[PDB]
Amino acid sequence: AYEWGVRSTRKPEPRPLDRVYEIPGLEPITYEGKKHFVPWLARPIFPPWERGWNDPRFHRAAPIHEQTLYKEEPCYIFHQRCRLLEGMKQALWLTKTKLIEGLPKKVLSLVDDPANHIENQEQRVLDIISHARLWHSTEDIPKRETYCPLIVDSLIQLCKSQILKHPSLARRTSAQNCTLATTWNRESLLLQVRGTSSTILSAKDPLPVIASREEVEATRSHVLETFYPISPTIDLQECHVYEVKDDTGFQEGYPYPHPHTLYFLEKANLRPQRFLPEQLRAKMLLFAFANALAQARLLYGNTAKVLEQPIVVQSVGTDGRVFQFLVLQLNTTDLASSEGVKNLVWTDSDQLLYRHFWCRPVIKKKVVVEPVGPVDFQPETFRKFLALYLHGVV
Amino acid sequence: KKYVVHPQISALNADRWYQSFTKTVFVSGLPPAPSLDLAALRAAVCDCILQEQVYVRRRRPRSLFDRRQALASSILDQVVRTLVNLLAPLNPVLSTAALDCKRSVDFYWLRGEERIPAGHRKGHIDALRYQINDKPHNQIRISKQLPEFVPLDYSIPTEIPVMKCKPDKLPLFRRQYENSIFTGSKTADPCCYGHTQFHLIPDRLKRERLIRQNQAEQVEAVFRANAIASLFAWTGAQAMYQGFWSEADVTRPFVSQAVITDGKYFSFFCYQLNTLALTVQADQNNPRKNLCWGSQSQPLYETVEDNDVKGFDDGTLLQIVHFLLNKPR
Amino acid sequence: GADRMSKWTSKRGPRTFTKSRGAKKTGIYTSDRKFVQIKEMVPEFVVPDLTGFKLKPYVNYRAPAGIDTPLTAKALFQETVAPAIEKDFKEGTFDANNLEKYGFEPTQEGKLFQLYPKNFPR
Amino acid sequence: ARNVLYPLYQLGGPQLRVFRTNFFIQLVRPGTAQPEDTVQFRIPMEMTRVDLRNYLEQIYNVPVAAVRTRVQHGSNRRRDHKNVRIKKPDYKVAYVQ
Amino acid sequence: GLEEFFDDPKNWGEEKVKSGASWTCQQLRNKSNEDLHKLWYVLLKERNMLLTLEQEAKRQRLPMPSPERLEKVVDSMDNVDKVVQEREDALRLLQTGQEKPRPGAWRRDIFGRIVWHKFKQWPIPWYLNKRYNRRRFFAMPYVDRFIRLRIEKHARIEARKRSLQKKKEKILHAKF
Amino acid sequence: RARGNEYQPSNIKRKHKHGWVRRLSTPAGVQVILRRMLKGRKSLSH
RNA sequence: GAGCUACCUAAAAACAAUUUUAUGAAUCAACUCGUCUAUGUGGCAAAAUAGUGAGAAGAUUUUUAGGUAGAGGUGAAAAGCCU
RNA sequence: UCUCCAGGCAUACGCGUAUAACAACUCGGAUAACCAUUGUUAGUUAAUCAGACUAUAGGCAAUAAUCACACUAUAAAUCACCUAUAACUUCUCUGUUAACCCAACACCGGAAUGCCUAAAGGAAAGAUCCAAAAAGAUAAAAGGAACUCGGCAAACAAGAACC
Ligand SMILES: [Mg+2]
Ligand SMILES: [Mg+2]
Ligand SMILES: [Mg+2]
């Protein structure tokens, strides 16, 4: 079997010890007294050195087996960079959930009412796109690490202007770069999630439940799909030094205990560093599911049971052009077994706000084929964005 | 080659120098000249302070020196977004405004002349060039201009300072690079006017450090220099977007406001632009001049104990609300 | 065509070449590229109070100068240590073990001002 | 102090104190025109701007607000009767406000 | 204040300034350590004023008044320095017996010469310091030829010097 | 083409090719220094 | 002794307008090279100047640092080049 | 003030006081004026421009670029994020001038990148005269390769065919 690492690049073996050391009963004469090396005297052997006090700049870590938090059983941790090979199918298995395509009917209807329409909605949306892609910068072509965050903040500001119609929108706030974690078990596997959110919208009141108890119970017929020979833990980080923690994102006593929506961004300029659509959706489920579970465990303790009051959380993710929407309902905390009542998730995938943008006009033979600005704008996508924001008030 | 002007700078008496570079007169005070549940706003603002300091959970900064500065940035961003949100019903214009975070403002102008002192070009006459490159923490841009604070051609007896030495003696250095005039967005954007700016002072210039360096008298001067440079740049860029330059001077005054905070103390300033004719050629017979009004720094609160903010002052909160409630006529 | 004889300083060479002119360091550089000054590393001038002092830069021409006698280790020992030992020896209360009583120091460790190796400047 | 060794400092060490000072300075008339507050000095090449602040405040009881320094290259162009270059020494200039 | 960097305003423009003699070593020895510490700064401020005046005279292209004042002050400061050194030197001998404050050793360099090496301060012991280990304190056998060449070269210089002295004496005896 | 300009000065190259650390790196270079010391050269290396 | 030149390694950079297409294509600047003629010949220059010419998105040109040394190195072989 | 000409300003590399004022009139500039020369005194100021800038141990990566969307193609193509340990408020040091470098010279030569093309930067004639020969430019009656080794060079031509 080929061994990696050619010998010439490896550190060289220590010099052989002087033969005078072999002879028993003889004291070698070395250059230790001189305090410097000479080629014609024996090489001293020194005992290991101890400073006698701690210098912070030269601290040295103890080995893994000596760590106080070392545990023989392994914990698999899912974090931002993890990219699941099987995509959604693997994500559903880990979270014991059933998938429904399309958004819930209640949320969709919120925007069909023309009363919820914003004034000059289509024109204002077009301006935000142009500002994000061209106008905000002094450069000729801005980069994704700037406009991808910018488009989302501007859209939130547009929707947030609806407080004039609905005074009840003053009961929610938003934070930046909050963190979330949860520990749970699936079929003898210890699993943990460590993550962060770009922005988190929190409300003072819980969201309405989506599915009735009858629908929740009917899920028992559904069976979670498997993907042999690939294990469920492929692409997760195996850790032997870990601590069990749960985190919603705020400490106890926060006036707005109900998280409303979670936002996730793909702002990397280079394509290989950006999650693909399916892998982005898988990340959204686990991160959102962790937020819901941590909130549950907080209220009902560490016991496992089917929840009397299901918890609902929303999630939105984008790279600045394509948008994906998510709604999750947490029905049970008894995840050890693979059979029983299952959680439910609604997904709307690959929603294009615009197809392309030109920062300079396209000229062929002194004819302007394409003017600057968005191409093939689709207003439908924003309405789905607006509907999720309004949910829970209107 | 052009001098580079820093709004936030540690040099002594920078404000007096910036007046000469700009032809601005500074008046201490405020410009000559509906209940909204002030208690509710007090609750909302206190929520913002406590959320970032005591409730949010986020990864600690590595540096250990960015921690204090990073905290102060978080609260100021939260305060601006809420106050702008809460006050939208009373002032409808705030609903259609555009809110910017750490975007760039640029201005380039000519003022003065000098003789080249050495080399093969010795004796030739050259203009003195300046540029301001700035990045305000927050700013609001609207699509309609605000009303004036005093009529154009307003005259007061106070005299602009005159400096004997060259700008170099105030530590100030030159470079050659692109000249830019920028309001925060390109000319194609509809929102071409300014409403208010929010600034956060670097930790290097805060009150405690200055006292140790023995320049206690410079605590207030730092605030003034930041306002004069930042607001002169923003108004000048706005005017040139309307087509006015040194040889076609402004016909209507341009106005804007700013609040400058070091994290706890706050001060308030207003600026009016009357002249873009600052060059030697265009300034030979010009009686106009630019005006700036400012106030001394006042604390907004003192400390956070348990989960309660202690020392909240309503008087300062009124000034922030008054600035945000100004509207076009 | 280069000059071999003039001194090599930081004004010469490309940008990436730098060196000091002999000033002592006053702090440390961390990672993250931040300088951190240390207060104890900055020298402190100990200046006495000069009020009511009778001595001035110059001396009168009528002041008699004295024969030069540089101080030696023998002279210091006789003036300071010899008298005490002589009295105790007459009384008989003297032993070699208690030389520290007369001011002898076995080792310089622990002292703020060590005489060898010197740990303080002028 | 110049031409002397400083004790090496490690975490938790004493303060460094120099009882007798080896630095000598001279006040010079500005060649150019300077602001009214500013003063010029010639200082030894080993002195730092921090040292000048403490030197003036403690020895001379003068309050100082800022300090800036530069190194001036001395000419090495003049030659002696055997055609050997003469070097004018490099020196340091300090501006005190 | 800054006024101490100049002479008494009355003296400005005068051709001469009266001054006394510089401090001798023996007179200083009578004084105590505390007195000497204060006397140092009294001399120091006089030194700065004299250096200031010297430079200003060059700028105005005029002779410096009473330039001998500077030499006296510099001599005085030197005597103060040694007197303090004498006291420290004696005390070190009594307590430690060492003749030098700084540690050192006699070593051979790579060129075959014998030089005194002054030690430096380090936070770690020598056998763990990789920058120090690259320094060599020995000479290899190709240096032996150059050691002989140096010895012979020094021998020629001495012979010529003694020969010249003998010839010069011949001239003196003839003349006188 | 016109010759006479083969010296294209560069301080980094000059110190690496003919400098003090370079001369001491080999025994042949150390003997270069010894010869110039015996002659009495004022400049041992670049 | 490879700061010139020959070849290689690493990190960087430049290429307008027009016609074709989809390219060691075309016209022609920048830039690189050097066909032909005259002037010059201790010359402005120990190989240049003035015109006129070849290539100019490629086996292209250019910058910085490193490598190979004389019984040798390098070479789209001219017994070329290596201050 | 007028007449005419049309690569300038910055950075990198290199150079090392040639920088500025006054004074000199010896030497230097291939001559004067004036200095680039001689002597004396002065100068370049940064937590942002530029350089240097030592916490430790583990775990882990299928998906280019080109307005990156569509779109294919072939030569297959720039630390992050997590897990634990430790520390728990800071500004000193160095570069900064110039008409400048490599070519024996104040050499019609060579010299990387960014912006811009006159708003920046400059002067072909020391005075006079109007010969020969020599060099460069422009115009020419009638004829149009008869010139020459050869349409070399020049031309109101700058096109075609074949070995
Ligand atoms: Mg040569
Ligand atoms: Mg090479
Ligand atoms: Mg080359």
Ligand SMILES: [Mg+2]
């Ligand atoms: Mg092209």
Ligand SMILES: [Mg+2]
């Ligand atoms: Mg060729």
Ligand SMILES: [Mg+2]
């Ligand atoms: Mg061809």
Ligand SMILES: [Mg+2]
């Ligand atoms: Mg061609």
Ligand SMILES: [Mg+2]
């Ligand atoms: Mg081609």
Ligand SMILES: [Mg+2]
């Ligand atoms: Mg052949």
Ligand SMILES: [Mg+2]
């Ligand atoms: Mg042949």
Ligand SMILES: [Mg+2]
């Ligand atoms: Mg040769």
Ligand SMILES: [Mg+2]
């Ligand atoms: Mg000059």
Ligand SMILES: [Mg+2]
């Ligand atoms: Mg003159």
Ligand SMILES: [Mg+2]
């Ligand atoms: Mg000169």
Ligand SMILES: [Mg+2]
């Ligand atoms: Mg500096």
Ligand SMILES: [Mg+2]
């Ligand atoms: Mg920097």
Ligand SMILES: [Mg+2]
């Ligand atoms: Mg390093």
Ligand SMILES: [Mg+2]
């Ligand atoms: Mg310069």
Ligand SMILES: [Mg+2]
């Ligand atoms: Mg030549």
